[PDB]
Symmetry: C2
Subunit: 114 residues, 2 copies
């Protein structure tokens, strides 16, 4: 019982989540594993949250989806120091993810949606 | 898979749900429909369409729709209007084009801005 836009975002999310196989970004970060996280990161985001937003039809556009993805990675790269696995993975998948969902590839997709 | 394939598979599923007895799931043979190949020069079914998707032979949703219409037009051409096959095909052709309407493809596109 879905829609085309939800199917497209689920695809993109799935492709992004496969770049993160240990589920570093799969759920919210707690202060219990990350002291100060809720004071340093005031706009938390994670893949599970983006999943629930897809399920609730809360994205009107891929630009909105991308901005949540950007936020998640920017948070990881803000709270974690540059030599941690979390920083480095967030860096790599931000740039990979934005290439996957580039302006140009979405123009191509828009063409194919006729 | 790619995002065109995910989208067409979505449309295909939503189409095949409307044919639970599988009247269009496979190719019509002359055995099951004599005279078929003499009348229908360009046969099509849901299974062939599935395979074109998995083979990424569909460059656009217009190619996909046009294969869909073909399947339904073929069924309405071979079968008379008081048959189960004619009637289901008219009906799914209708629902398929309401689903894959210019109006709805416009909404989808905007949502890729």
């Amino acid at each position: 019982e879905s829609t085309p836009i939800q199917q497209l975002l689920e695809h993109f999310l799935r492709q992004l989540q496969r770049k993160d196989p240990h589920g570093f970004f799969a759920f919210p970060v707690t202060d219990a594993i990350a002291p100060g996280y809720s004071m340093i990161i005031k706009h938390p985001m994670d893949f599970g949250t983006m999943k629930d937003k897809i399920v609730a039809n809360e994205y009107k556009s891929v630009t909105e989806f991308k901005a949540d993805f950007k936020l998640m990675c920017d948070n990881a790269m803000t709270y974690n120091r540059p030599d941690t696995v979390y920083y480095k993975l967030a860096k790599k998948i931000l740039h990979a993810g934005f290439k996957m969902m580039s302006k140009e590839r979405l123009l191509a997709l828009k063409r194919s949606m006729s």
